[PDB]
Design an enzyme around this catalytic site. Structure first.
Site, mmCIF file in Angstrom:
data_model
loop_
_atom_site.group_PDB
_atom_site.id
_atom_site.type_symbol
_atom_site.label_atom_id
_atom_site.label_comp_id
_atom_site.label_asym_id
_atom_site.label_seq_id
_atom_site.Cartn_x
_atom_site.Cartn_y
_atom_site.Cartn_z
ATOM 1 N N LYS D 181 0.899 -1.136 0.000
ATOM 2 C CA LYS D 181 0.000 0.000 0.000
ATOM 3 C C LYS D 181 0.958 1.211 0.000
ATOM 4 O O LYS D 181 1.890 1.135 0.792
ATOM 5 C CB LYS D 181 -0.983 0.082 1.111
ATOM 6 C CG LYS D 181 -2.030 1.142 0.876
ATOM 7 C CD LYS D 181 -3.162 1.083 1.841
ATOM 8 C CE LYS D 181 -4.332 1.957 1.476
ATOM 9 N NZ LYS D 181 -5.302 2.051 2.596
ATOM 10 N N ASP D 253 -8.095 5.522 -0.333
ATOM 11 C CA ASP D 253 -8.670 4.297 -0.945
ATOM 12 C C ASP D 253 -10.181 4.237 -0.691
ATOM 13 O O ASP D 253 -10.724 4.370 0.415
ATOM 14 C CB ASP D 253 -7.954 3.044 -0.745
ATOM 15 C CG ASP D 253 -7.739 2.557 0.649
ATOM 16 O OD1 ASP D 253 -7.473 3.363 1.524
ATOM 17 O OD2 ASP D 253 -7.787 1.274 0.757
HETATM 18 O O1 LIG Z 1 -5.962 -0.977 2.951
HETATM 19 C C1 LIG Z 1 -6.374 -2.096 3.712
HETATM 20 C C2 LIG Z 1 -5.897 -3.458 3.251
HETATM 21 O O2 LIG Z 1 -6.609 -3.743 2.066
HETATM 22 C C3 LIG Z 1 -6.121 -4.502 4.336
HETATM 23 O O3 LIG Z 1 -7.482 -4.571 4.771
HETATM 24 C C4 LIG Z 1 -5.714 -5.919 4.124
HETATM 25 O O4 LIG Z 1 -6.325 -6.505 2.971
HETATM 26 C C5 LIG Z 1 -5.949 -6.799 5.324
HETATM 27 O O5 LIG Z 1 -5.288 -6.257 6.435
HETATM 28 MG MG LIG Z 2 -7.380 -1.164 0.804
#
Ligand SMILES: OC[C@@H](O)[C@H](O)[C@@H](O)CO
Ligand SMILES: [Mg+2]
Ligand SMILES: OC[C@@H](O)[C@H](O)[C@@H](O)CO
Ligand SMILES: OC[C@@H](O)[C@H](O)[C@@H](O)CO
Ligand SMILES: OC[C@@H](O)[C@H](O)[C@@H](O)CO
Ligand SMILES: [Al+3]
Ligand SMILES: [Al+3]
Ligand SMILES: [Al+3]
Ligand SMILES: [Al+3]
Ligand SMILES: [Mg+2]
Ligand SMILES: [Mg+2]
Ligand SMILES: [Mg+2]
Lengths: 393, 393, 393, 393
Positions: D181, D253
């Site tokens: 991320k 997001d």
């Molecule tokens: O931005 C959040 C992420 O998508 C998480 O929820 C993972 O998928 C699990 O920890």
């Molecule tokens: Mg996410």
């Protein structure tokens, strides 16, 4: 650099009061008593405080509680000398506002939201605020078919014009300031940038008292030049307020301390607020308001440090920006680059369109390749500005 | 789906004529004769053609050459029946325009640029164009101290108002359409988004004939919702023209075929152009113009394929968008979500501000937690729209 | 701050030799002769120069021309003492590379691109370069169905391992450095960021001699943190060379002077190159290579100004960064925030997963609520860095 | 298209259980009971459910409560037959993890985070999960000086290798999957994109059992191509699990339903998961896991609608993608464009770098100008895919 009340640094109660909860986690700080905030801010050099009706008075507060809270809050104002230049309404936290206040699809909710703003105008008036801010955070959509886009703009005008009409009616010395934001909390927000807010104002019945409250981070979230955006707001005489903070790119609104984002942009925003335009023009004369959030990683010493950081950042940029334009090298560099030349009208006094097409020197006999040889030297003017920013000049 | 001249698909000569040179490489295609373009476009179903003065007439062309070219070009127009709805000026390719046309720091250059636009208004008038586009591509800066931002906006107004004044003076049936772009070729461009162009129009002396020419990719380069942007332009009655293309994110302007970028956004742009607003409102009635560039990877079969792809994409989206709003399930879903309810005024006939604050049902006795229980079902309306887009309904 | 050869400042021939053609206009400056380029660079305090094979030798040059160019070029090197630390290949400007060099869908273009690189390694070795950069600018696509994504990577591997193996086979003292770029000129480039570049190298047969050549502007085009990105390469022992410049935002690559983009980021990049890591670790000892382009608005005086500006910017930041770290107040702010405590292993010498699992104090009896009160004081620590950057401490 | 267990569609408990609290407001829905969640999911055609340790067992729960929760939870699994293919840990919501789990600057928080993960592996194994996801959401910073960047990565390695080694030591049948991320909730997260994740795994002692868990929305937050990104993971044999959702743009997001973001991208993601590569290669055989959140504007009917919508969207795209590839016209368009020719090795069996170097036909006598005329017809090939996506071929 020590801020004094003469600097006009105002802070919202939600800024230092922000508790630390975000999308992925709970609050990391205890609630901040409003009396305490007022006393703390006054000891740091703040000039004033701003709030959202629910920052102060809980949504479900009985009348007795509201009087108490207000009594406590006005007492702190009397003790410290802090002013309250701006008041705003929370049309976003309660679940009823999930689709907006003013542009909610549900009509009963649109009516409650306008009722809640009208009552808040009274309060704003009683606190002596000069500005009433409207940040339409829930006005927008995640999906393109959720709204009738022309009816959303009529609905927004109805609310803003009713508010403005009511001010005029009551004889209140208050101006409305709309605060654009491109996204977050909604996927897409209505009136997303300074240009979209200014455009909308021109369609209003009571647009003479409606102007803008641009926020640094919001414009940078669309990847726009914040300095250019406040220059257009200034140029249309609609820069009524400002929300200063920092943002480090196109992503969630970070709400960092002012100058903790795009530093060079920050530098040129302060030059524009302090120095005005190089050839003259309107000047921003209001509160320098910080709308930021102390990082959730930090405890309460961090909160007062970050309050301080804002005013320190403004004052250091200001010192550099005044040094920057006072430097003879910089003035010469500005001349060479044609900064002053931009200020001269393109046509001659009483020269018409026909007159100029006709003039052979401006067109037919104009030597385009010779003209193109001008070294505009914008890089060297840019290096000069950064060297003053870095304190090396 | 077969486009017919009744569809009004217009293409600029620079689109199919784009040769393939970019920042990192030379042209991959031979120049396109303008006569050939006209004949090709007419065989595909195009309704018209648009151009920049230098797309057609070279910068250094002698008078004899200009007459020849124009003779050749008007002959092709007479043979095919193509119209010329829009004409525009190139104030960006020659090196003299490196700092802008209208907002150049050099005054002699500002005067040449306005002279070049004035002459081009004559030509536009002679070709029978209804629209004259202004895309201020070199108006802006890379560095924040390069310009006096208030003087840049005065300089831009001087140019646009002189142009508009001259149209009125000559009795030409032409409207000016400004085309916002946030960046590229400059680091920052003046009037960067639909809202910034609409705001500027309201400060013009001759703003009644000045409107917008929004481009899909340009708005998406700021990460904005293009459909929302043309809805505000429509709502202010300023959508005079459109430049359709596709963009796949916040990056250089790709200029892909319309629908080859954000497909769902494309879908809702066509619904807005074809279906108008769900509760009624102004409708876009002009040319559906494509401003794209055939990928440089492809040879000339690819060029005619991509011209075709544009109109095919529009027609398929159109079919789906008409199917979408005609579906009873969709109409019911729109009702449930409050799309129609947004259209009802918030206040009752002759209900004032005071009247509503007073009404206990709208505020004091309003049950905020019950109201908040409404399932707006925007996800299900979104799924319904996509299922119609995918042709599964 | 005056640069000197000892500073290891290198510039590409294409940077100062960039003439101004962008996608919306032609060259605004005359071509720079490469011998003049060596003389001018050496005089400014540069240590070396880098180039692309077609920056010096035209694509069409005969062997007589090639030998003529190199003899004058090598004489200039001699006269001045500039080294040539890195050599690279142009696999992007000619129309043959429109779908790529190594990953072109056409096999015959793939063998031509690889042969062009193989001959170029020979020239690199002859020149005494230690690094051979590979920027795969046309390896990618505009549309997702254009490529078999696994095949594209097999072919990229094949080219790099063939080139790597050729170095190894001839015993040249050279390492390959891949230069990631997310987009432009392709809508999507393969190996778009530092991570993809590093990941890809681990799948190579000859990975031992392949590393990276990150570029500031390139990771900022994906909105990534350039200091985090180079830290990961440094940590992997894969930062073999670097390309320094500036970028203001997610948009086309601007290639501004280093420092003229995100200044606070530039400051911390310089702290990582110069000072390394707070707790110790790897250090980047290579040349400080500037990959930028002098703005097209400026004449040749601005080109030499810009070259100068890159070196000054680097030395001013360097100074502030040395003073920042040397500051006892800063070192104490770092110790409060836990910068040095991150350097301690989480596990005790000899502790095992089971050990920690069943250590009641680290889990079962841990006061999570007490541990969360820790003021990390990250805001204060950030304010100290900006105050050093601003030349105020 | 009705989903069935055989489709391998899994949903996290936090997706449909997401109650609506965002950064500007509170929960708009009542808490979902996990037993109800299993019953509802199973009925919709789901194959399995995934969860975070605190999605099921509160942070404060006693051993009696924990055993009570698991027994009812395990009974529901039994009753319905849903599997639990992946288990993950919450290392981001409690205030103790405000600076991170594994990379927290505080050592005592680092041992607590690792112990929390170690106990969670035991629960994962007991549940029969094959994958243990690791999303390091608080590993990062808002300011560049907050962390020693090499130390942050040494500590990240230490946690993952300790956990990986514990699996290996107890012989659990589990693989670890890292979920990159780029930002949010930190201004910058370590291992921000698929490439950084894959690069990092190659520095691990126990890398053999560590792979990735890419998420659509997460690579789109850096503006990267999700299909290119998963293709690279697939190519490396490191795509161990996936998180499917939608995102409209570079912004916070959104976690929309899969398909409700970038639709053309979603179509090609589905072609890669379902169909693999055109020339053959690796295939992703895991569960099709939906990591999204039902929009806060909708009640529980919209929550079940949204769960349904993810599966329908996937099956509609799947269908179009199978028909797209099966189409003889498409297979012929692919052969024209060179999709299959990219599958051929550039070098001939047994050819060496020298061989190709000195092969006159591949370099010295190559007609580069003839090779560049090749119409790759990428536009036409793209139009064929959209027409299949639009349900028109
Ligand atoms: O931005 C959040 C992420 O998508 C998480 O929820 C993972 O998928 C699990 O920890
Ligand atoms: Mg996410
Ligand atoms: O993005 C949030 C905005 O900054 C608002 O907080 C306004 O400043 C006040 O409603
Ligand atoms: O970004 C380029 C713009 O799209 C222009 O081409 C206008 O359409 C015409 O000047
Ligand atoms: O975006 C362009 C890249 O920066 C290249 O110039 C490499 O540095 C050399 O090929
Ligand atoms: Al604000
Ligand atoms: Al256009
Ligand atoms: Al480079
Ligand atoms: Al996930
Ligand atoms: Mg904000
Ligand atoms: Mg364009
Ligand atoms: Mg570059």
């Amino acid at each position: 650099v020590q801020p004094t009340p003469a600097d006009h640094f105002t802070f919202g109660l939600w800024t230092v009061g922000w508790t630390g909860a975000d999308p992925f986690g709970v609050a990391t700080r205890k609630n901040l008593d409003p009396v305490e905030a007022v006393h703390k801010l006054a000891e740091l050099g703040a000039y004033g405080i701003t709030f959202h009706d629910n920052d102060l008075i809980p949504f479900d507060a009985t009348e007795a509680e509201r009087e108490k809270i207000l009594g406590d809050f006005n007492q702190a104002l009397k003790d410290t000398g802090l002013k309250v230049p701006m008041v705003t309404t929370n049309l976003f936290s309660h679940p009823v506002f999930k689709d907006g206040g003013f542009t909610s699809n549900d009509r009963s909710i649109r009516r409650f939201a306008l009722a809640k703003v009208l009552h808040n105008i009274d309060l704003a008036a009683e606190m002596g605020a000069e500005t009433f801010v409207m940040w339409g955070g829930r006005e927008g959509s995640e999906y393109d078919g959720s709204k009738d886009l022309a009816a959303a703009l009529d609905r927004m005008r109805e609310g803003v014009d009713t508010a403005a009409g009511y001010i005029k009616d009551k004889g209140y010395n208050l101006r409305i300031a709309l605060e654009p934001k491109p996204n977050e909390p909604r996927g897409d927000i209505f009136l997303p940038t300074v240009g979209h807010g200014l455009a909308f104002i021109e369609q209003l019945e009571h647009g003479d008292i409606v102007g803008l409250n641009p926020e640094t981070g919001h414009e940078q979230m669309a990847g726009l030049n914040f300095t250019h955006g406040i220059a257009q707001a200034l140029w249309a005489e609609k820069l009524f307020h400002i929300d200063l903070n920092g943002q480090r790119g196109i992503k969630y609104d970070q709400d960092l301390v002012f100058g903790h984002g795009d530093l060079t942009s920050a530098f040129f925003t302060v030059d524009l607020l302090e120095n005005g335009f190089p050839n003259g023009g309107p000047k921003y004369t209001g509160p320098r308001h910080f709308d930021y959030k102390p990082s959730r990683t930090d405890g309460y010493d961090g909160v007062w440090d970050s309050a301080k950081a804002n005013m320190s950042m403004y004052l250091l940029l200001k010192e550099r920006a005044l040094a920057f334009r006072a430097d003879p090298e910089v003035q010469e560099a500005m001349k060479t680059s044609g900064v002053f030349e931009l200020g001269e009208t393109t046509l001659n006094a009483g020269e018409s369109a026909a007159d100029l097409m006709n003039d052979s020197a401006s067109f037919a006999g104009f030597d385009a390749e010779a003209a193109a040889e001008r070294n505009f030297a914008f890089i060297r003017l840019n290096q000069l500005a950064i060297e003053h920013l870095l304190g090396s000049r």
